[PDB]
Design a protein around this nucleic acid. Sequence first.
DNA 1: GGGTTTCCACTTATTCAACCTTTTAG
DNA 2: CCTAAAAGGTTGAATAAGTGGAAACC
Length: 298
Amino acid sequence: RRESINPWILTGFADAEGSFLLRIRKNNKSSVGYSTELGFQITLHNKDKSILENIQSTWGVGVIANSGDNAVSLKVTRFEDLKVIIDHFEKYPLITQKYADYMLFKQAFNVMENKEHLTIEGIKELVRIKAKLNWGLTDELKKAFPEIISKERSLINKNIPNFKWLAGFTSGDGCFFVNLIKSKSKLGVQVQLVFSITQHIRDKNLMNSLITYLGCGYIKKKNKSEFSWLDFVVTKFSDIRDKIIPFFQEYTLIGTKLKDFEDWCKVAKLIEEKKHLTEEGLDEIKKIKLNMNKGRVF
DNA sequence: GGGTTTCCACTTATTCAACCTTTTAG
DNA sequence: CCTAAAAGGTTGAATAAGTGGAAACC
Ligand SMILES: [Ca+2]
Ligand SMILES: [Ca+2]
Ligand SMILES: [Ca+2]
Ligand SMILES: [Ca+2]
């Protein structure tokens, strides 16, 4: 059932789940020896295929396909379709550092719109653009286009623009979790509700702003080898009851995350009724938990 | 139909989400 | 003593991003 997604929900979701793409491919059938492909894409779990169909219908662009065993993607690379992407993100701009990637995608669009990508000089300009996009140059492009190139990206400083963006972002990178803490009590399990949003460290400022915007929570920094990311986290029930739950009751989530939030809420009500301290209440929470998050079948 | 664009199957890197246990706060 | 909140992580790919191959187009 195709439903129109609000454009700021969509942009918040794009900030959490979109990726731009710029292919500069060796091609023995291209006059300059390289062909290109420019686009935007989203990859989700199969259980969320509906989001992709809603976006495909809301925009009128893109093609949907399996992405391996368990995921599905919406890719938009038809050049004329990319005008839709630009019109959307011009009106409802990305908020995270991905915004810099959007601007690089715009620059590549302009090169191609002037048909300059059919010249080697235009291929070279696309390479300079791609050197700053996402993961930058591949080994093949480094080898083929030796050049000291600026690598500094525009640092993005933008406030959360409105709460629909936040609902979109949370639908992508958020998590509603029932933590079962093993204790020695007679019941022997403490039920703890956790709300989290996870993000690369490059957007520490935006994540830190969530403390102010939502009136609760804290930031946990995590490092693993050379990689760093952050979790905005809320574990205090009174904050979950009075701030997190009413926020998302008002600003609706999309996809499977919505059902997780609803289940989470059913656990919160049980907790408020103190039935998490009874055996029968705990069994019910355990049963709700088994069907949340990755365990959910559909 | 030659050069170019678009699509579709599928993979690589690593940023997510989701999942744990132990300790501290109240 | 008791429960709630925070601290302190780990797991593993539903990560973000990218690739190989060719059909479709004009
Ligand atoms: Ca994300
Ligand atoms: Ca994704
Ligand atoms: Ca997600
Ligand atoms: Ca995500």
